[model samples]
Target: STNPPPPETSNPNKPKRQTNQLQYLLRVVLKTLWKHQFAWPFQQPVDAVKLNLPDYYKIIKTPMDMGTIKKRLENNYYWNAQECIQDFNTMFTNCYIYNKPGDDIVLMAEALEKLFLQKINELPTEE
Candidate 1:
């Protein structure tokens, strides 16, 4: 059998992305899932993916699963992650309910959605 991957490493020096700390406060995804015994999600990267705050912020800008947002922003840029709550909600309703995502995947999607919902730092405005 193949060997399992390694544990993720953290820089700690990376800028903190979410001050709201939705996941931390809710304790209902990502950080929670990883800590919960040996449980894991299917589609998630099966590597030692130590996604630091900046990387995570990047992921928020554009999720791999093609999840959508539900709101409109004043100046939503191409790489902005600020408008995701409503989009995620719509996707969840369609995929989570109709497609019948498993309990863990539900949490996985929830974690992703919340991450996108978080209020991240603004990009440098155009000159």
Candidate 2:
């Protein structure tokens, strides 16, 4: 049998998706930007340094070598916030800009907008 879903948890970065169409639209317009000093140097090109994270990464311990794990976590966090956000924005913009009319982009965007609203309303106030 397949493994069950992970338990509800919170990351300081991830937020609950907004249910309101206007709210979602506003967030879409004002995409996330990295502001912290730790993540700033990597912003312009925004290419993340890849790290080899192990299955036991979540647990920090002496035997696992905290230094190695710490470095991996920092690099992962740096890349995760730096690259993924900008790449997603670039892709979203390109998708809309490059697609011609009647290419079903309109239909797809609208359908997704609706589905987004529905899912937000249905989602519990948990991770």
Candidate 3:
């Protein structure tokens, strides 16, 4: 195409945002932890994409797809799998069980709900 916009360069006069890749990953990890800690209602575990962990970690590691994330958690974080699954189930159940009329249900709106529910359907079921 048109020379790919000549490759952008950082502005020397502007202070660069010191975004730590590890901290960014940790932020996603922390959000996940908070989600489990608070047992917040979520449509699904695979919906963790909403946390943008992969994108954040991609700054350091290669971007991981949902299936790859599952494998990573299962293989390396195996010890926490049960806890994660339990937390995920509890969160989803709590959301449905605690739904109240006139409650501000849409944190991110219906599109997010649809996306999350779809992601939930894609997760591997526990054996």
Q: What is the TM-score of each candidate against the true structure?
A: 0.27, 0.24, 0.26
- Clash pairs, model 1 backbone: 68-87, 69-87, 70-86, 70-87
lDDT of 2 by residue, 1-127 (tens): 2222321223457433323332332243212212222223222221112333242223212121112222323333222322322433343343354345556644443443344345445434322
Clash pairs, model 3 backbone: none
Q: Rank the candidates by lDDT, best first.
A: 3, 1, 2
**What tens-digit string does per-residue lDDT give for candidate 1 at 7-58?**
1223344433432323222233323323443334322332224423233323
A best-first ranking of the candidates according to their TM-score comes to 1, 3, 2
**Cα lDDT computed for each candidate against the true fold:** 0.34, 0.31, 0.34
Q: What lDDT score is found at residue 4 in candidate 1?
A: 31
Whose TM-score is higher: candidate 2's or candidate 3's?
3
lDDT of model number 3: 0.34
Worst 10 residues of 3 by lDDT: 1-10
